Amino acid sequence: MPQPKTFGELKNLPLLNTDKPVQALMKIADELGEIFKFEAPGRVTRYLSSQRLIKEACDESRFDKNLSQALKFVRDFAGDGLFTSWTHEKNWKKAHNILLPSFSQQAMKGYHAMMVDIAVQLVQKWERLNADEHIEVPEDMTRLTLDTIGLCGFNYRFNSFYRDQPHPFITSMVRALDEAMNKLQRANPDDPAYDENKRQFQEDIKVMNDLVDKIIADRKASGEQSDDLLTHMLNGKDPETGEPLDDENIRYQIITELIAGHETTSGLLSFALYFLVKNPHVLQKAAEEAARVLVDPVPSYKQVKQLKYVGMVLNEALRLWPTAPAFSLYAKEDTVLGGEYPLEKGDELMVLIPQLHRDKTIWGDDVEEFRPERFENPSAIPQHAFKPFGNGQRACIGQQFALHEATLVLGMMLKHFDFEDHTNYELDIKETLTLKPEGFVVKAKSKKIPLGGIP
Numbered sequence: 001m002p003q004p005k006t007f008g009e010l011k012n013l014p015l016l017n018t019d020k021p022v023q024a025l026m027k028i029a030d031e032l033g034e035i036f037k038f039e040a041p042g043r044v045t046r047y048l049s050s051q052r053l054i055k056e057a058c059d060e061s062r063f064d065k066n067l068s069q070a071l072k073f074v075r076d077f078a079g080d081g082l083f084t085s086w087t088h089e090k091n092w093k094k095a096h097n098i099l100l101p102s103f104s105q106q107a108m109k110g111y112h113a114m115m116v117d118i119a120v121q122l123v124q125k126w127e128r129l130n131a132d133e134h135i136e137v138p139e140d141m142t143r144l145t146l147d148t149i150g151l152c153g154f155n156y157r158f159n160s161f162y163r164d165q166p167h168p169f170i171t172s173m174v175r176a177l178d179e180a181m182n183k184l185q186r187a188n189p190d191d192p193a194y195d196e197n198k199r200q201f202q203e204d205i206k207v208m209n210d211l212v213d214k215i216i217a218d219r220k221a222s223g224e225q226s227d228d229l230l231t232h233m234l235n236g237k238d239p240e241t242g243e244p245l246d247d248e249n250i251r252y253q254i255i256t257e258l259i260a261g262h263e264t265t266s267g268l269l270s271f272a273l274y275f276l277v278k279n280p281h282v283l284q285k286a287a288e289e290a291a292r293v294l295v296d297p298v299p300s301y302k303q304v305k306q307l308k309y310v311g312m313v314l315n316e317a318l319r320l321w322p323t324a325p326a327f328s329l330y331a332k333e334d335t336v337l338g339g340e341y342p343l344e345k346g347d348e349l350m351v352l353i354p355q356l357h358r359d360k361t362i363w364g365d366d367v368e369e370f371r372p373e374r375f376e377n378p379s380a381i382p383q384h385a386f387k388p389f390g391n392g393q394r395a396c397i398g399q400q401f402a403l404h405e406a407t408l409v410l411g412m413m414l415k416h417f418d419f420e421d422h423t424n425y426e427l428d429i430k431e432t433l434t435l436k437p438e439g440f441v442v443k444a445k446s447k448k449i450p451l452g453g454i455p
């Protein structure tokens with residue numbers, strides 16, 4: 001098994017002392033192949049890139065979700081929420097059972113109005129820009145996804161489109177996620193040089209906890225019901241144990257929904273618009289569908305479901321740049337991977353999704369091209385070839401929410417504006433916990449189509 005450059009004591013770790021670790025790992029994969037070993041002080045990981053090996057890794061009888069170093073650090077503020085719990089932790093099963101119906105296709109009918117509320121705000125913002133002015137794409141997409149999850153999660157308005165400086169909760173969340181990712185590169189965590197980082201981290205945790213805990217308390221006092229996750233959780237009983245989630249876990253689920261959902265989804269919308277402006281004939285086809293389908297001043301749930309080609313566009317963006325680009329597994333028992341790589345019980349595997357999605361033996365020679373028509377017939381895609389939302393029982397619980405949101409918003413964008421790549425933008429991918437196009441800007445010329453009133 002191949003292995004990239006080592007640095008004594010530090011092993012491979014310094015290779016990731018970069019602002020773009022995942023793209024670093026992709027370049028290494030390009031040279032080394034379908035599997036390579038990556039060592040840090042005190043840990044070992046095997047990175048997987050081929051569909052041949054990843055299909056075995058996705059066999060839940062042999063491998064289970066692992067809490068990576070990154071997820072362990074995120075747990076300091078996401079607690080035992082769904083994203084950062086072990087599969088066999090009692091609160092995982094319990095929360096999974098309770099929350100499943102909150103994330104179904106039927107639940108999307110209830111969330112639709114609040115998704116439209118924020119989408120309308122985004123469209124109005126762009127309708128109101130003066131001539132020559134431009135749009136900062138990832139920045140606005142993130143305002144949109146944070147505000148949407150705020151409403152659908154706990155009926156709270158962050159009012160991001162009313163601000164230059166985000167709501168303090170958002171600032172704190174973003175900074176805590178930053179600190180979590182930065183901790184990955186620290187050989188000496190308790191060095192006094194990180195005392196300030198530690199102070200800020202605890203302050204940011206308190207900001208998040210204080211707001212969510214207060215809203216939960218207030219909500220239990222009012223009795224108010226909404227189409228939000230908080231109401232569902234306050235009223236929901238586990239099908240198995242018959243118990244509801246306790247108030248602390250409810251808080252962790254609300255924080256979790258925001259962490260897991262806002263940045264992946266905004267990254268997706270950003271990458272999709274990028275690929276559209278770089279491929280004008282695809283943009284035209286997608287805009288034609290939007291105009292054909294979205295015939296009312298405000299889109300309805302049933303109309304979003306008709307945006308088939310927009311859906312193909314989103315899937316092809318997720319193929320090329322899956323915005324949560326890696327997930328971690330561990331071997332349940334000793335086992336041989338792909339017939340040639342022995343694993344010991346507890347051994348960690350990392351699935352490199354962007355590499356999976358560029359496996360020529362699956363997709364063909366043109367894997368680098370943006371072609372939504374790949375997804376015209378789903379039955380064509382082999383099992384475990386396309387995994388932007390993870391695997392099995394530990395797959396993204398938010399998948400239907402993300403796709404409904406992104407399809408609605410991209411559809412409305414295409415209905416209401418023509419877009420210009422005015423700077424001839426060169427793709428630069430920023431890495432946090434997730435991936436996004438840094439500095440992506442466009443100009444949007446309104447088609448001057450009336451936008452209807454909302455509740």
Ligand code: HEM
Nearest residue numbers: 082083260261264265268324327389390394396397398402
């Ligand atoms: C394009 C958008 C999204 C992508 C690509 C994405 C991707 C993923 C992936 C790959 C995982 C598995 C992580 C692992 O194995 O460690 C995951 C899990 C999860 N995601 Fe998403 N996600 C997206 C949007 C969302 C949204 C909008 C929400 C909430 C509204 C959400 C909530 C969650 C939760 C709670 C989990 C953990 C589920 C469990 O293990 O029980 N995600 N997501």
